[PDB]
Ligand binder design. Structure first.
Ligand SMILES: CCCCCCCCCC(=O)OC[C@H](COP(=O)([O-])OCCN)OC(=O)CCCCCCCCC
Ligand SMILES: CCCCCCCCCC(=O)OC[C@H](COP(=O)([O-])OCCN)OC(=O)CCCCCCCCC
Ligand SMILES: NCCOB(c1ccccc1)c1ccccc1
Ligand SMILES: NCCOB(c1ccccc1)c1ccccc1
Lengths: 623, 623
């Protein structure tokens, strides 16, 4: 285990009048500069420096200056200025101010990080004025984002200040003469203070207000400080911009704010929403499509559909501009959606005919042509599904609850092709596969219920249970096998249940409401056999009643309004897929919106126009 | 797509020192009148006028004055007075102030509409003083009432002011010397400012308070301004008065207010409720029956029962006066309701006897007389239902959930007459129709459960499910046919399910709790047949459990108090129908209430007396 960062109780580990580490750590933690007065002479005589291993905590590299800054009284410690002076007077080739922790838990942590976290502006000035490097990165495992004891803030001093909500510190780090911070500076993950603010977001009303106020403030500060730099166009090492990371992470509160952002006055160029005209309850705005429109690779639309794993995903697609943008893409695409459904219906009708009236193991030529059409249709679907899974490869397995139709379309195509292979091999097992393929092909027809709102919102309200059906079956099949062996073993002796599979299927019938209690008067232990069947029935009815109740509690503890939101996400995934066109013929992707000058920095952007009517909001504005 | 009404970003389309449109639109949008100083000379030299196509936006006809009024700074634009002066000085045969948009989206929109919407009283005065026509109608598709981007306010300047809650503007438009507005003036739909206020209503607490305050204020203003005009007696082009339109539209908050309206002092003639005497918790009021009592065609009672499609309909019939009026009409009618039920019981008893003991394909004469009575009874019911559907023709298909008994009474009569026709033709299919008619005739008996409160409120709480029964059957019958073809196809091969209909009916039994899992040891693929039946059962139980849960969520998310309200609406529909009498004998409709002088304008009205006891309200009035 790593040592505590500071402790009143446990001493730091080991792993002319004398001035050892424990003497030094005692004076600086008490804060009494007059007791430091032998130290320069001792160091000089020995040729030792305060950076040396003998003066650190052995396991971390934590120095006397870090010890001093961990121990502040009313934001001050009178040792810091003398101790820094002694380092300068010593002639150390390294600088004490820039010393860092070397432990795998606290790696790169420095006195400046501690000063900022202790909220002492005086110490921040005092360190920066004495040559503190404002770009050292606290990159150790305590500082990385994961489960358990950690605090991610980015890794830089400016990013800590921002995430700790210290505006005085942030402005001093940016504006100071000695070593000004950079808004462009980046951590070991490529995250810039704007990315760090997106990562610390939690979608809570308070955290959101802090994050939004610190994000906007820094963006305004950047407009003054570094006017030639687009701070929101800088990408992580995963090639995400702060808006794209807010989408990936599912930080809906900050995502909404960035996407909708509007300012008047000198900061207008920092807007993404530009209000165009109002009339009564009608508001028309232009929205900036930059990095949002599916025209370009790795957009927020593709990230929300494919790369995000947040439960928030459906809530994100119903925000403007995305809600109107996706509606326009759907209105353009919907003819191709019903054409695809028509082709699938024709294929499934030909499949149904070819399955239904087929000989036992002109009309023969029509049956052969029918087999050929379903073989070709099965190959075509197989290729299309293989291309889908290959195109998704970097983010497969994100959401089975959105993906499962793509697996079942693959499965139906595989069994169709395999059945037609076995039919060419003339082997009787082809008929089972063709019939099982017909069954999946009819069930797969439910995919298209998303293409109509009436059937799309009903299907989404329902399609709740298929996750619970497994948990039931797995638990129950364990009861089933135990009672099945017990029945077979007990039925061997004469004065039914002949095999484990036979007995399991009888016990299954008793579960699904098809049971048959009677005295089995053929066999010796008929009373004990009846006891087992009674016990099995009662335990099964308990387990079913438990399942029903568990499920019903999650029905009372539910909100109906998600149904429309989840249906919009299904249409979004459909739109984004079919905007590519088919595996055998790529689509020309045209850009949405139009290119307009929104001001001067010439600030020209692809803007999408959105018209919103809001009687409630407008009436609140009246006298 | 139509252009934006105004844009900072997109220039208006095209489709002596020079003074083109872009020079002109630039000066007036900036608001700098000194830059306008060449324009008169240029226009004069060319013989051009500011109304001409060259100076408009080409696609809309939007003029420089509309551009000027779209761009107000602190409610002003210093260009307007110079620009109007230049139009007068030009000698234009048209007047710039009265220029209007010609686009199909903004048709008839004018500078005065924009000024009012921008809430600039100064511009309204400045336009009216320079000859603005206060009766131009904004009738384009943006201004009509429909789905998507629009704002209906009526179409007139006075109606916009009222719906935008501008009392200063409303009074100035009414009272000014130059061109006074008319409270009687009417839009392209016949709607007068009072109708427009009913159309903008939404039944929300805030919208209702605005609408009510603007309606009452205008009605008081009309009493002063145009004393000889009954503003509430003016009809739409659909022949509806503002009260009747509030009923049709289902605007229950404004409907209640108009219906119940009471004033003391100089405005007393504007009342519809007149308080008569109070004693402790007892209040007696007269209510004005004008346009409310079913005596006259197209009353609010007939509109609520027949012509309204709002979910609010049941809430509207329980307001006074209507609640006591309908109770008095029911108390008068109820003998005829039970007489009709007695005749239907006698017919259904004779039908039951004649169906039950009938020969295979004196007592014979009694059976023939029984057939004649049910033929005549079936003809009589057929005619009565045909007359009902013809009388309803303008508003059939409003509410199947209120109408369905009128369809099922028609259906039973058709099958009865047709069965007796086939019985005269001596063909064996008559017995199925007579028996199917008997079944419907017994189910139709449930209609009369509304005639008693004990059975009327119980039936209404229940009769929830019949809409969900279809959605279940349709989805489920698609699973059924897919598995049915699959079973038939798989059962053809020997070592049950012989036909698609046979297999479908077996799979139906498995759904309704009558299933039969067994190894079908007669046929080759018995294991795969059992796999299909297991899969079918499990998918069916998932689909049933989904339906049960969906339905149960709409049971927790429900309010029981609607039951009594919906039963009153059923009695209202019954009352209004039977007040006509029968298809073979029209009823004399007597008027309700009595003719009383409620004041002097002699203000004599048909008043209905209502007595209400309200301990709770009265006790709040005590010290
Ligand atoms: C109207 C007459 C049709 C005759 C039958 C043709 C074979 C159809 C095979 C089939 O079922 O295709 C369905 C497919 C839509 O797939 P999807 O995107 O919904 O699947 C995934 C949904 N979850 O449809 C398409 O991709 C478009 C149809 C084929 C275009 C021509 C192909 C030419 C190839 C050289
Ligand atoms: C007491 C002895 C009765 C002997 C049987 C007479 C035939 C009755 C046929 C029948 O079922 O009539 C029901 C009908 C009421 O209909 P409704 O308004 O409830 O239907 C719609 C409800 N949803 O009832 C009536 O309209 C009134 C009864 C008939 C009056 C005499 C007719 C003379 C014609 C020249
Ligand atoms: N034939 C299309 C009917 O649409 B509906 C529908 C039918 C089956 C599955 C899903 C939706 C519908 C939904 C609610 C009430 C009434 C009908
Ligand atoms: N015979 C008339 C009984 O009325 B009740 C009634 C019976 C059947 C259908 C509807 C209502 C009733 C209602 C609630 C509690 C008890 C009885």
């Amino acid at each position: 285990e790593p040592p505590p960062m500071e402790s009143p109780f446990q001493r730091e580990d080991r792993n002319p009048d004398r001035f050892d580490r424990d003497r030094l750590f005692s004076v600086v933690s008490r804060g009494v500069p007059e007791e430091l007065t032998g130290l320069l002479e001792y160091l000089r005589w020995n040729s030792k420096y305060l950076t040396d291993s003998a003066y650190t905590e052995g396991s971390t590299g934590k120095t006397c200056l870090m010890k001093a800054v961990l121990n502040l009284q009313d934001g001050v410690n009178a040792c810091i200025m003398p101790l820094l002076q002694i380092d300068k007077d010593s002639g150390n080739p390294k600088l004490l101010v820039n010393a860092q922790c070397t432990d795998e838990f606290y790696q790169g942590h420095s006195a400046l990080h501690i000063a900022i976290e202790k909220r002492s502006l005086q110490c921040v000035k005092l360190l920066v004025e004495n040559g503190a490097d404002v770009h050292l990165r606290a990159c150790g495992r305590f500082f990385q984002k994961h489960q358990g004891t950690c605090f991610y803030f980015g890794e830089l001093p400016l990013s800590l200040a921002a995430c700790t909500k210290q505006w005085d510190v942030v402005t001093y780090l940016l504006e100071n003469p000695h070593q000004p911070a950079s808004l462009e500076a980046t951590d070991s993950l490529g995250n810039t203070v704007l990315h760090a603010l997106v990562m610390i977001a939690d979608n809570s009303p308070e955290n959101s207000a802090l994050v939004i106020h610190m994000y906007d403030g820094l963006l305004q500060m950047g407009a003054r400080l570094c006017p030639t730099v687009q701070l929101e166009e800088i990408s992580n090492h995963q090639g995400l911009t702060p808006l794209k990371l807010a989408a990936k992470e599912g930080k809906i509160e900050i995502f909404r704010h960035i996407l909708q952002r509007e300012f008047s006055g000198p900061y207008q160029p920092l807007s993404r929403k530009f209000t165009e005209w109002c009339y009564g309850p009608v508001r028309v705005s232009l929205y900036d499509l930059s990095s949002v429109d599916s025209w370009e690779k790795n957009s927020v639309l593709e990230i929300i559909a494919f790369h995000c794993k947040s439960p928030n995903r459906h809530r994100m697609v119903v925000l403007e501009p995305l809600n109107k943008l996706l509606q326009e893409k759907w209105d353009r695409l919907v003819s191709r959606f019903f054409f695809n459904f028509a082709c699938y219906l024709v294929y499934m009708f030909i499949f149904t005919v070819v399955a239904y009236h087929q000989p036992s193991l002109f009309g023969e030529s029509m049956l052969l042509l029918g087999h050929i059409l379903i073989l070709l249709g099965g190959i075509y679907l197989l290729l299309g599904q293989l291309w889908y899974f290959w195109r998704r490869r970097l983010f497969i397995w994100i959401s089975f609850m959105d993906s499962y139709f793509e697996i079942l379309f693959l499965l139906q195509a595989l069994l169709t092709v395999l059945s037609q292979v076995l039919r060419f091999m003339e082997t009787e097992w082809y008929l089972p596969l063709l019939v099982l393929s017909l069954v999946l092909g009819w069930l797969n027809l439910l995919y298209y219920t998303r293409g109509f709102q009436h059937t799309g919102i009903y299907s989404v309200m329902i399609q709740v249970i298929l996750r619970d059906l497994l948990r039931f079956l797995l638990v129950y099949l364990v009861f089933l096998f135990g009672f099945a062996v017990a029945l077979v073993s007990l039925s061997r002796e004469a004065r039914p249940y002949r095999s484990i599979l036979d007995a399991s299927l009888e016990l299954f019938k008793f579960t699904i409401g098809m049971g048959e209690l009677a005295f089995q008067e053929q066999l010796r232990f008929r009373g004990v056999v009846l006891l087992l069947l009674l016990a099995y029935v009662l335990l099964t009815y308990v387990l079913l009643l438990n399942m029903l109740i568990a499920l019903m509690s999650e029905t009372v503890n539910h909100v109906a309004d998600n149904s429309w939101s989840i249906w919009k996400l299904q249409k979004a995934i459909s739109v984004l897929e079919m905007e590519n066109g088919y595996w055998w013929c790529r689509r020309k992707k045209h850009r949405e919106g139009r290119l307009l000058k929104v001001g001067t920095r010439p600030d020209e952007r692809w803007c999408f126009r959105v018209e919103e009517v809001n009687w409630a909001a407008w009436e609140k504005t009246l006298p």
